[PDB]
Amino acid sequence: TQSHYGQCGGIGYSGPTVCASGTTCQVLNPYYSQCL
Numbered sequence: 001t002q003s004h005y006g007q008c009g010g011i012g013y014s015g016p017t018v019c020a021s022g023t024t025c026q027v028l029n030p031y032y033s034q035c036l
């Protein structure tokens, strides 16, 4: 899972897409999504 302020899963990202407990994957940009 991705940590707080980490890139969860935007377009082009293939790593830890599921955010940690208490954080939501906020799509800041189509490619940049951050666990907030």
Ligand SMILES: *[C@H]1O[C@H](CO)[C@@H](O)[C@H](O)[C@@H]1O
Binding pocket: 001, 002, 003, 019, 020, 021, 022
């Ligand atoms: C991601 O996996 C779980 C998701 O809730 C977290 O509890 C864990 O700490 C890790 O960051």
